[PDB]
Structures are given as C-alpha cells and as structure tokens.
C-alpha cells in the first residue's frame, strides 16, 4: 500500500515518446551503411538463420516472412511478406539480395504470386558483397536480435533503388549500375577524383540522360510504316494494365490510334497504328515531340538523397559522391577491426599448432612417455612446462593416427603455414585488404 | 470493350486459338512473357465466384466476371455456340483446392448452359504436374501422386519439388506446360443436370 | 499438344475425395493409442522441437502455435493457438501435457489471457508417460512431419477428458484419475479381473457418482443459518458469469434469494440468503430436493466412447475396460519392438567396447606399435585382424588420455558392463519392462 | 442490476473500497482468485473506448461501458461524488501499448469530468512491473527499464523475465501486486482543459 504520489501529468510524454519509438525504429528511410530497410533487416536475418549450412534449400516465403515476429518485429507479418517479394525479384534490382524460385512477377505485371507457392533463399549475390556479418554492432534494444546494420563492401542504398515516404521526408534513391558503384568505391579508396556513378534501371534497354540534371528516363519508338511504329520500351514506372488504362486506352477512345498488343518476352511491344484523325506531321521534329508527348515516352525525375547514417541521425546528401565517401570511410574502420581480430586469433592458432607439433615430436622421440603415467600424470607434468601448460587439455586430445609420420610432418608444416599467415596478417594494411575484397565481388 | 483481356490478333478470325481462364494476374503475366504471339490468348479471374445455378439467366448476366467472359468469347447468353472469338477455352487454376474444388465446378456449371460447347469438347483443362522430380540436368514431370508412388521405385537423385499452386512453376516450366500441354477435357455424361445438381 | 480427351464425369469425385480428406485427416475425434487430437499433435510436436536440450525454456505461445503451418497443418493458426491453452492449463486436466507460465484461466473464468503474454513448454508430466517417441509409425502422407500417434504408457484418452462433435458422432470422454488408470493398466498387464477406473474431475472436491449406468456430478450445499447457506461447489461445467446469468440472477429476479459473492481462491463460494417469498419447507428431504433442483446442484451426463484406433477406422466402445485392454495389447507389441532394437544396438556397442579394450591393452603391451608406421600403416593390418577390421576408423580415433591406465582399466570394465548389460536385455521380457515403465510414472 | 461487477459487501459503506478498472476477462478472473474478500472490488473493460472529449454528456451516456462504470461507482454524469459505492478507483492495463496508449487517455478524460473527485485523488493507477529478475531462488521487481539498466551492474544469475501484459504474471506475482501494491495519482494540473489537447 506504499503510496508514492506526484501530480505530474507531464508523464503523458511517455505516450509521445512511445509514439516517437513508433516513428523512429519503424520508419521507412533506408540505412546508408547497409542499404536495407527495417523490414528487410528482419527478413534477411530470418533467411540467413533458416539457410544455415544448406543455403541452397528453398524455404517457403510464408516461413521466411511469417516467423519474423520473434526476431523483434513489432508489426504485422504482411509487411514482411510483401517486402520479401519486392526485394527478392530480378525486375526491380540490379543486385538481388535474395534469390527466388517461383512467380515473382516482372515489369509486365508487377505483382507477386501468393504467400506460400513461392520460395526464397539467401542468394550468392549476398555472400560476395556482405562480408564480416558478425562484426555489426548490436542494437541498443535487446529485442532487436538482428544487428543495427550489416556491413557490405559497396553501398546497397545506391543499388536496387529505394522509394520511401516518411513523415516530412521522402527518399527516392535511384538505382545505379554495379560496375559504376564498384569503380567509384575502388577509386575513392585511393583518394582520387570521384567519378559519378551512372544510372542503370533493371531490365531496361532504353535511354537515361541528365540533360537538365534531373536524371530523366525516356523510351524508344521505331517507325515501321507511314502509319505504324514499334514501341520497344516505355518509362520504367509502367506495367501493362496501368499504362494501357491510364494513357493508351483514352488515346484510342479519342478516335486517334489503335494498338496491337505485342508484349514479347523482352520488355513491352506496344505497336500502334494511327488513323486519319491525327496529325502525322512531317519535318521529323514536331512529330518527334508529339510522339514522345502523346504516348508518355518522356519521364521527369528528381533525386532526393535522404538516409539514416551509422547512428540514429538522418542526413540529406546533395550528391551520391558524399555518400560514397562517407560509406567507404566507415567501412575502412570496420575492416581495420577485422584486421586486428584476425591477427589476434591467428597468433593463438599458430601457438597452439606449435605446441601440438612439439608434443608430437617429443612423443615420437620418446622423451616423454604417453603410457605408464599414473592418474594421467601427463597433464600434471605438462602444467609445469614453458609452453605446454597453456593448452594441456588440447595437447592431450590427440588421436592415435596423429602420432604417425603422416599426421606429424604435415602438422609441423601446417604450424609453419600458420606462422607465415600470421606474419601476412601482421604486415597487411586496410587499403590492400579492402581492395582485394572489392575485386572479389566479381 | 473488356479491359483485362489478352486479346490476340485472331480474335473472331477462324483459327486454332485457345482461351486461358486462369486464376491470378501473376500467372497471366507469366503468360504474357510465355504466350504465343498470335494463337494463345487468356484472361484472369477474380477468384471465388458464386455457384452457376440457383438463379435466373439474366442473373447469370448480373455477375461481372461472367459478363466479361461471355463478352470475350462472344458467346452471349441465350444463343447458339457461334461467333466464337476464341476457337477454344481452357481452364487452369492453382491445384490444391483453390480452383479444382472452387473454380472448376462453378465454371463447368456456367459453361453447361451450352451443351453444344461440351459436345464439341472445346472446353479443356491443362493438367499441371503435381510433383516435379529434378534428376541430373533434365527434370521429370510426374503428373500425379499415384504416378510418383508407382514410378519412384527405380530412379536416382530423387530430388522432389511440390508444385502446389501455379506460382511454384518457373518460366521454363510454364513455357513447357503451355507449348506442350496435356489438355484434359470436361465431362459429358448421359444426363447433364444431376451430376452438377450434387453441387447443391 | 497431346490429346488426352475423356468426357468422363467421374472426376467430380475429386471433389468428394478431397472433401473426404478434409473430413478425415482434420476431424475432431481423438486417437485411442496416444490420446491426442489432430491439432494437438502438431502443437506438441512443435513444442518438443522448440524445447530441444533446454526443455525448461519458456517459449511464447505465439511461436509455439503459429509455426505449426510448416509442420503440415492445413488450417488456420487460431485453432492451434486456442488448443494450446485448453490443454496446457491445470483446471481442465488431471495430466497436464504442457506446463505453462502465465494467466491460463481457472474454473472461475474459463478464458486464456492472450496470444503472446503467456509461455509454454513440454511439461515433466510428458516425459515420464510418453516414452519411445521415435518408434511411432510415420504418417502415410509426407507433409505430416509429426508421426501418426505417439506411444504413451497409460491411455491419455481417459485422462484430461475430451469433448468433440464430428459429423454424425460425438465424444464426451470423461476424465479419470491417474491412480485408477495406472492400477487398471498394471493389473490388466497380468490378465486379472479389470477394475473399472474411477472419475476424478480436476480441481473438484464435490461428489461424482453414477445413478444408473451413466455418471452424474453433484455439488455440496452447507447450511449456516435458518435462511442462509454457503455453496461450496457446483457442477463442473460452470464458470462464474454463465452460472450467475443463467441460474442465479433469474432466481433473484423472482424475488426469492439474494447472493453474496464469496468466490474464494478454492473454488466457488456462492453463499446465498433466502427471503420470505420462498418455501423453506421442513422434513430435510423436500428442502434438499428443492435446493438441488432450483440451484442447479445436479448434473446428468453420459459416456459416448467413440475414438479412432491405431488405423484409420473409428471404433465405439461400450465401456473403458475394452479400451484399456486394446491399448495395452498394442503397447505390448510396441514395447517388444524396443526390446529387440535395444538388444541389437547393445550387442554392437559391447563388441565395439571389447575391440577398443583389446586395442588399448595391445598398445600398452607394445605388441603393435602406433609409431613408426608410415602411410598410417596401422589400418592396413587392422583390416586383416579378426575383430579389428570392423571398427578400424573408430579403433584409430583414440585420444592420448585413453592410453593412460586410468581411462584404460575402467574402459575394459565398462566393456564388461556392456556385456552383462546385453544379457539384461537378452533375458528380459515385455511384461517386466512394461511393469517397470508403469511404476516409473510416479 | 450491473452484471460484470464484483460488488463487495463493503461497497457503498464508509470503509475504504477500491475499484479495479482492469482489462481482459483473464485479469479480472485472476483478481477473483486473488481478491480481498471484502475490500477490493473490480470491473473488467472491453478494450478500445471512444474518445470522451468533444461531445454532449448524453454522448458519454451513450457508450455501454461508460454507463456501466457510471452505475458502478455511483457518480452519475452531471452530479458530484458526494456519495460513492467505492471509496477508491484503480486503473490497470496491459502495459505495452494496449492500455497506456488506448485505455489511459480515454479513461483519464472521462474520469476527469469531476474535478472535485480528481482533487480528492481517489482515482489512482497501480504500477505493474515491467521486468522481473530471478536471482538465486528469490525474485526482484524492477519497475521500469531505466531501473533495470541502472541496477543490472551488480547482481548474480541474471534470469530476466519480461512482463508485457497482465497475463504474464503468476499467482505469487499478482498476490504481491494486489496485497502489497504501489499507486500513482492521475496528476491533473491547474489546466483542466489543456493537457489533453492531443486526445482528438
């Protein structure tokens, strides 16, 4: 009945604070270091957990994106289920972070199949570009079992694109080609003049140009007769149904053109035949503007580069060059950490191998007898030797076949190899290691 | 003028064209990427549809999806089987219970109002393989559970893949199924009223 | 373009057959051997899978009963979620097959708390009565990862009760006391006269007795004044809200009695005070009958023993004696299987231990040298020894401390133990083993 | 008249009497199992209750739950708290967001409509523990995450158990929380009509 009592209604801030927690840890802005979203973090963590040793196994999408609740996802599983198909496909990403087996849709029809008829796995495109997963800092909150952000080699924010709309901010990071980003990161490692990465939409063979600096995207029209042409492509943000209904069907309803659906296996194929009630002007420049105006072949665009940094703060970058520079600056330190830890582990491994070789050659030499030692007196006398005492248990767990010359000479040579590999780790630097990692990605 | 259609160039023209009354727009996208450019058509369904009998003919016409399909095939309610924009009609649905147990009987009940259509046998079904065995480089296409059980005795590399649902198929599988199908046809007994009267 | 045209109407049975599968493998009738229900099978299988080594870990109910989809449950997770609280409590079972930590309700209010605020684990009451889990026959269908039915020692159909209503059949298996069922099984092992097990409702201190054939349940009314009594208990199928609203509030609405809610921690406590407008007759037998009628202290019931047997057939038993006899007949064979397999495994284990002891004694004797043998020459001669050749790979995997006399002498003795242990399995019979298992349960 | 109520013998008397506005039938049933036989009452809520600000008093009387609590406490809308069936009122909910974010604002706004009762301070809330620490064989009752973070430095065998809602606690826990409870007033400052400006 201990009654402590204060008339502090300001505790109602715990609502807003909680709402702040509901509008901070569950935002839609991606993360600059790892290139993920809050939903995709849990999705990829669950996929990695399920894959285990047999990463080639195709897990059901329902199991992939429905069991994320216990991982620390304070939202409905529907968001994870839908975000597991808008990221694991190939028509929307230059870098598929999750390979799939099933009907994931295409640019013709941007719709997934179902919840359980498809499968997913951690693609081979993730292991070559997301090294050092276990060094990601753990989240401040315990329930966030997946780390704050994985550590990739090239920034995944740039690739695969992303379009999010938060409270007061909007991110529309345009996708970039893998080669351009790799070259930019490699050249920014050595501090040269940074070359702006290009833009390469997935499954796009049209044109993307920055005449006004707005990064606009335009398709290709190809005349085949005096009153026919073969539209090979249209701007990216278009599927068959929405394109038809929104622009092309009203154009036909105006009594101007008639379209023959020829959507082949390679993009759109919307061939169109005009009629009498249309301009069909000459001079090849007015008809040029008309052909890319009436059929919506011209798309304006803008880059709103806003993203969360390594910490909880959110920053807006004017150009991708600053993003590349900051990401590589962070990854340099996160690679130095791995360098130090590798040195520390390799020294101990070499010492253990040296002790093992010493024990094996002393035993085969007969200086110390394996048999006749009462109450495993071996361990007792090894505890008072210069190097033995550190690994006595490991020095006793020696198999019979480890005594013969086959597993003794090779053991000594392996110890020497561990020594020289420790030297290699000692003498190497961050720049060379990161350059090797950058080259490894392809 | 319907909108969901995949109308081919031979709509109305005499040919060996086929109509796919498949379920799920996701499948019809695969069809667009796989279809024959001139022969094979198609149309997506909405899903669970009301039982065909239990009400009047104008009340067949009341339903939106039924209206779209009769407009597409051109077989308007109350007439003889003529003016067929598509020479053939095929049904293909997710084969666990979504279309086999829900869509197939209702669609046959609706198509039953033209016994001439069943007499021609123009209404058919493409059997999707229930299980796929991935052996070596070339996979096999066991079409039913009984075949799988009777043919699994002597086969190496018994890697099994269930094809429950049309979404499980890849582009190669769907291409093979469409280009080289089995085309099971619909029933025609001595009486065409009692066997679907079991529906109610 | 293969034809395969048959205008056959028999394919409509594909409806009924499938519907048959939807009304055969997803019924509500329990199984006589294991005493479960189809949903409870998957629930318990997932609980056993999640428990693993740390069976004491409290898993969330949402994780327990929501991840059953991949185990082969062709139904919504809500059935598993609700069946995980009506079996894991203590107010509805004399044998809780799943211990829990949270608000699972009680007889006062028969309602669980939530989906995620509670926890569950495989109780210690399951490991002492469900031995030989890995010998359950696998289901005919592959997707049914949990076996067809686990193998318990006493029939769990009788205990904990069950109430199901299938198509055309209804089961209301009344719960029985653990001691009665254990005694019945033990005495029916030796083929004596089977004693009918008693009936013991959970958290019931009232009276249960059969009037003529069928069982009935009655509570206890205790008079404290000329116009007051203290209802100690009421029939089992009653919670506070429904009891009040259905019988007691209408009684007060007639201007007869007024109730003082005294529902203590130990069951119901509905004390009642009369008023003038009632009989309150004398002679101690008409007043008693009027009390047991108006207050609903008498509940009639019947035993409808219908249950699925070890096969797909459903059988109806007139009395529980036949169920006990058939269950023990099945469990006798399922114990004989374990006896045979134990003999088979123990013989091999003893042979391996004998070979191990032989090798260590020959090595310490120096007849065969482990050193100086190039190309691990040991195996080559071990392959041409009478008993070595069978376990060469194991015979060379000997640690250093295994040459020590401490781990050598005992090893031989251990081998000897295995040898005599083999005899223990060789001479024992099914009856003695099952009697020991029956005694082990308490 | 009232049905869900747990009216005690001391209800309506001059003795101390507390009313529990708990959430969920499970919690009130657990109270029944753990209640004081004469002093503590209680009543369970339904869940999402409409915002009580911005309508007529008849609209407060419209909602069933508001009518039930109005009849239970005996403080009729538009009247005063001169007589009350229960001396005290306690509010307790599942403390993750179910009652803190939903029950709290509506219930506080409804109970504030009588500033005299507010000044009496009879309306109170019992703090539920957020993490329980099992140390050795005893248990400790960290009342907030900040206390856990500032007191986790020095304790052995850190067995952590979260308490998201009322269902997590056991009979020992609820018995301790009821027989040895800690309260907090509703805290309204001089601005009656200003601190709940975010309710609508």
Cβ D150 vs Cβ D143: under 8 Å: no
Please report the residues numbered 88 through 147 in chain B whose beta carbons come closer than 8 angstroms to any beta carbon of chain C.
97, 100-101, 105, 118, 121, 124, 127
Nearest to B113 by CA among B161, B61, B154: B61
Token pair 């069978």 is found at C390
Angle at alpha carbon of residue C338, lines to C335 and C344, rounded to 5°: 150
* Interchain proximity C102–D3, CB inside 8 Å: no
CA atoms within 13 A on the CB side of A313: 2
Q: What's the gap in Å between the CA of C310 and the closest CA on chain B? A: 24
CB A97 within 8 A of CB A125: yes
B68 is in an annotated binding site: no
Residue pair A296/A217 in contact (Cβ under 8 Å)? The answer is: no
Cα Rg for chain B, rounded, in angstroms?
18
Phi, psi of C231 (to 5 degrees): -60, 115
Residue C7 in contact with partner chain D when CB distance is under 8 A: no
Contact C7 B118 (CB under 8 A): yes
What residues are paired with C118 via a beta bridge?
A: none
Q: Are residues A64 and A118 in the same domain?
A: yes
Q: How far apart are CA D56 and CA D197, in angstroms?
A: 17
A neighbours by CB contacts (3+ pairs under 8 Å): B, C, D
Q: How far is CA A202 from CA A157, A199, A348, B124, C372, in A?
A: 15, 10, 47, 38, 64
The answer to whether residues A31 and A129 belong to one domain is: yes
Sort B103 into a burial class: Cβ within 10 Å, 0-12 / 13-18 / 19+.
Answer: buried
Residues in chain A closer than 8 A to C377 (CB atoms)? 404
B63 in helix, strand or coil?
Answer: coil
Task: Identify whether C170 is part of a domain.
Answer: yes
B167 touches A at CB < 8 Å: yes
Which residue, A407, A260, D1, is CA-closest to C244? D1
Give how far C136 is from chain D: nearest CA, Å.
35
**Burial class of residue D70 in the structure, from the number of CB atoms within 10 Å of its CB (0-12 exposed, 13-18 middle, 19+ buried):** middle
C-alpha–C-alpha distance, residues D60 and C82, integer Å: 35
* Cα distance between residue B109 and residue B113, in whole Å: 7
Which residue in this structure is represented by tokens 């020594």?
Answer: A419
The resolution in Å comes to 3.9
**Is D196 strand, coil or helix?**
coil
Let me know: does C64 contact C84? Beta carbons within 8 Å.
Answer: yes
What order do you get walking across the sheet with C257-260 strand by strand?
A: C220-225, C228-233, C271-274, C257-260
Where do we find the tokens 């400052």? D189
Same domain? C65 vs C158:
yes
* B28 vs A: CB within 8 A: yes
CA dihedral sign, ordered A11, A13, A17, A19: positive
Residue D186, min C-alpha distance to chain C (Å): 26
Residue C61, domain member (yes or no): yes
Please state the domain count of chain C.
3
Assess C56–D contact: CB distance below 8 Å, yes or no: no
- Do D127 and D182 meet the contact criterion of CB atoms below 8 Å apart? yes
Q: Does D166 touch chain C (CB under 8 A)?
A: yes
**Residue numbering of the annotated binding site of D for Mg(2+):** 94, 96
- What does the H/E/C string look like for chain A? CCECCCCCHHHHHHHHHHHHHHCCCCCCCCECCCCCCHHHHHHHHHHHHHHCCCCCCCEEHHHHHHCCCCCCCCCCHHHHHHHCCCCCCCCCCCCCCCEEECCCCCCCCCCCCCCCCCEEECCHHHHCCCCCHHHCCCCCCCCCCCCCCCCCCCCCCCCCCEEEECCCCEEEECCCCHHHHHHHHHHHHCCCCCCCCCCCCCCCCCEEECCCCCCEEECCCCEEECCEEECCCCCCCCCHHHHHHHHHHHHHHCCCEEEECCCCCCCCCCEEEECCCCCCCCCCCHHHHHHHHHCCCEECCCCCCEEECCCCCEEECCCHHHHHHHHHHHHHHHHHHHHHHHHHHHHHHHHHHHHHHHHHHHHHHCCCCCCCCHHHHHHHHHCCCCCHHHHHHHHHCCCHHHCCCHHHHHHHHHHHHHHHHHHHHHHCCHHHHHHHHHHHCC
Domain ranges of chain B: 18-128+171-197, 129-162
> If you measure CA to CA, which chain B residue comes closest to C4?
B184
Phi and psi at B37, nearest 5°, equal: -65, -20
Residues of D whose CB is below 8 A from C272: none
The answer to whether position C5 is within a domain reads no
Contact C229, C219 (CB under 8 A): no
C378 and A404 within 8 Å at the Cβ level: the answer is yes
Phi/psi at C106 (nearest 5 deg)?
-155, 180
| 8 Å CB contact of C4 and B180 | no
CB-based contact A265 B33, cutoff 8 Å: yes
- CATH number of the domain within which A357 lies: 1.10.268.10
Chain A residue with CA closest to D181: the answer is A1
| Backbone φ, ψ for residue A336 (5° rounding) | -60, -40
Please state, as a whole number, how many other Cβ atoms lie within 10 Å of the Cβ of residue C397.
14
CATH of the domain at A290: 3.30.1360.40
Angle made by CA atoms C310, C313, C319, in degrees to the nearest 5:
75
> Which entry of A19, A22, A73, A117 is annotated as an active-site residue?
A117
CA distance B78 to chain A (A): 30
Check B183 against C4: CB less than 8 A apart. yes
Closest Cα to residue D90, out of D187, D199, D196, D185? D185
Please check whether residue A332 lies inside any domain of the structure: no
> Exposed, middle or buried: residue D118 (CB in 10 Å: 0-12, 13-18, 19+)?
buried
By annotation, the residues of C acting in catalysis are 117
Instruction: Give bridge partners of residue D162 from the DSSP assignment.
Output: D131
Question: Are the beta carbons of C108 and D164 separated by less than 8 Å?
Answer: no
Candidates C360, C396, C404: best to mutate against A (most CBs of A within 10 A) is C404
A109 touching B (Cβ < 8 Å): yes
Cα end-to-end span (Å), chain A: 69
Q: Chain C within 8 Å of D31 (Cβ-Cβ)?
A: no
Domain with A379, as residue range(s), is: 341-428
Computed on alpha carbons and rounded to an integer, the radius of gyration of chain A in Å comes to 30
Q: Closest residue of B to C143, CA-based?
A: B162
Tell whether B94 is in a known binding site: yes
CA dist D94 and D176 (Å) reads: 17
From A287, A318, A349, give the residue that closes a domain: A318
Please tell me the distance from the alpha carbon of residue A220 to that of residue C288, in angstroms, as a whole number.
96
Let me know if chains B and D touch, i.e. at least 3 Cβ pairs under 8 angstroms: no
Residue B186 forms contact with C (CB below 8 Å): yes
> What does D74-132 look like in DSSP terms, one character per residue?
---TTS-SSS-SSSEEEE---TTTTIIIIIHHHHHHHHTT-HHHHHHT-EEEEPPPSEE
Q: Cβ(A302)–Cβ(A100) under 8 Å?
A: no
> A9 lies in a domain?
no
Chain A positions touching B30 (Cβ under 8 A) are 103
Does the residue A143 lie in any domain? yes
Annotated binding site of D: 94, 96
Query: End-to-end distance of chain C based on CA atoms, in angstroms?
Result: 69
CA distances from B121 to B87, B124, B182, B190, C95 (A): 11, 7, 14, 15, 61
d(CA A343, CA B182): 63
Q: Where are the alpha helices (DSSP H) in C227-376?
A: 240-243, 249-253, 286-294, 320-365
User: Cα separation of D26 and D171, whole Å?
Assistant: 12
With CA atoms as reference, the chain D residue closest to A21 would be D97
A263 closest CB neighbour out of B24, B25, B32: B32
CB pairs under 8 A between A and B: 69
CA distance D62 to B160: 62
- Among C5, C8, C9, C16, pick the best mutation site for testing chain B contact (most B Cβ within 10 A): C9
Whether D32 sits inside 8 A of C105 (CB atoms) is no
Residue A117 annotated among the catalytic residues of the structure: yes
CA dihedral of C191, C192, C193, C198, whole degrees rounded to 10: -90
The two three-digit tokens of residue A388, written as one number:
């033995």
CATH number at residue C114: 3.90.199.10
In a domain, A18, yes or no: no
Which residues, including other chains, have CB under 8 Å from residue A134's CB and lie 6 or more apart?
A: none
The reply to whether residue B165 touches residue A112, judged by beta carbons under 8 angstroms, is no
Distance from C-alpha of D107 to C-alpha of D105, rounded to nearest angstrom: 6
Q: Which among B9, B24, B32 is the nearest to A240, CB-wise?
A: B32
- Beta-carbon neighbour count of residue C376 at 10 Å? 18
Domain D18-127+169-185, classified CATH 3.40.50.670, yes or no: yes
Provide CATH code, domain B18-128+171-197: 3.40.50.670
Selected for mutation to probe chain B from C5, C21, C145 (highest B CB count within 10 Å) is: C5
- Kindly state whether residue A208 falls inside one of the protein's structural domains: no
What chains are in contact with C, requiring at least 3 Cβ pairs below 8 Å? A, B, D
Q: Which two tokens stand for residue C363?
A: 């090595």
Residue for token pair 């975000």: A83
A6 inside 8 A of chain D by CB: yes
């Amino acid at each position: 009945m201990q009654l402590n009592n204060r008339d502090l209604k300001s505790i109602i801030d715990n609502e807003a604070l909680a709402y702040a927690m509901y509008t901070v840890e569950n935002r839609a802005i991606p993360n600059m270091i790892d290139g993920f979203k809050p939903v995709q973090r849990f999705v990829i963590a669950r996929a990695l957990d399920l894959a285990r040793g047999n990463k080639d196994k195709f897990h059901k999408l329902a199991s992939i994106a429905g069991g994320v609740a216990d991982l620390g996802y304070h939202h409905g599983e529907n968001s994870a289920q839908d975000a597991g198909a808008l990221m694991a496909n190939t028509w929307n990403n230059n870098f598929p972070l999750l390979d799939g087996q099933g009907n994931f849709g295409s640019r013709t029809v941007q719709k997934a199949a179902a919840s359980r008829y498809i499968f997913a796995r951690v693609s081979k495109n993730f292991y070559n570009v997301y090294k050092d997963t276990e060094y990601a800092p753990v989240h401040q909150d315990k329930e966030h079992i997946p780390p704050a952000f994985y550590l990739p080699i090239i920034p995944t924010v740039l690739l695969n694109g992303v379009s999010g709309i938060a409270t007061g901010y909007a991110t529309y990071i345009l996708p970039h080609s893998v080669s351009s980003v790799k070259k930019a990161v490699l050249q920014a490692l050595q501090g040269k003049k940074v070359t702006k990465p290009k833009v390469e939409f997935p499954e796009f063979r049209g044109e993307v140009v920055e005449i006004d600096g707005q990064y606009e995207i335009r398709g290709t029209y190809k005349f085949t007769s005096r009153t026919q042409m073969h539209i090979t492509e249209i701007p990216y943000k278009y599927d068959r149904e929405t394109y038809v209904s929104k622009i092309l069907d009203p154009l036909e309803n105006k009594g101007f053109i008639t379209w023959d659906d020829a959507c082949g296996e390679h993009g759109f194929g919307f061939k169109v035949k005009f009629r009498k009630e249309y301009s069909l002007s000459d001079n090849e420049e007015e008809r040029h503007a008309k052909i890319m105006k009436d059929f919506g072949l011209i798309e304006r665009r803008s880059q709103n580069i806003t993203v969360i940094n390594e910490k909880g703060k959110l920053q807006v970058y004017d150009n991708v060059v600053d993003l590349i520079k900051d990401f590589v600056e962070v990854r340099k330190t996160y690679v130095q950490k791995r360098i130090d830890n590798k040195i520390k582990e390799t020294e101990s491994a070499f010492r253990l191998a040296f002790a093992k070789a010493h024990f094996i050659k002393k035993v085969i030499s007969g200086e110390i007898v394996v048999q006749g030692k009462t109450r495993k007196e071996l361990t007792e006398e090894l505890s008072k030797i210069d190097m033995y005492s550190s690994y006595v248990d490991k020095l006793v767990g020696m198999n019979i076949f480890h005594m013969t010359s086959d597993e003794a000479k090779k053991l000594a040579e392996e110890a020497k190899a561990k020594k020289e590999e420790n030297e290699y780790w000692k003498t190497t630097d961050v720049v060379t290691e990161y350059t090797k990692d950058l080259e490894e990605i392809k | 003028k319907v909108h969901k259609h995949i109308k081919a160039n031979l709509c109305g023209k005499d040919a060996d064209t086929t109509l796919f009354l498949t379920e799920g727009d996701s499948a019809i996208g695969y069809l667009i990427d796989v279809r024959d450019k001139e022969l094979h058509g198609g149309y997506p369904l909405r899903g669970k549809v009301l039982n065909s009998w239990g009400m009047s003919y104008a009340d067949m016409l009341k339903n939106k999806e039924l209206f779209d399909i009769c407009a597409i095939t051109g077989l308007v309610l109350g007439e003889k089987a003529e003016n067929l924009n598509y020479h053939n009609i095929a049904i293909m649905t997710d084969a666990d219970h979504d279309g086999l147990g829900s869509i197939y009987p209702s669609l046959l009940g609706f198509f039953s109002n033209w016994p001439e259509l069943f007499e021609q046998g123009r209404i058919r079904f493409v059997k999707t393989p229930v299980i796929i065995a991935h052996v070596g480089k070339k996979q096999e296409w066991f079409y039913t559970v009984a075949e799988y059980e009777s043919a699994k005795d002597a086969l190496p590399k018994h890697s099994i893949r269930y094809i429950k649902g049309l979404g499980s198929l890849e582009k190669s599988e769907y291409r093979e199924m469409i280009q080289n199908p089995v085309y099971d046809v619909v029933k025609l007994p001595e009486n065409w009223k009692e066997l679907f009267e079991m529906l109610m």
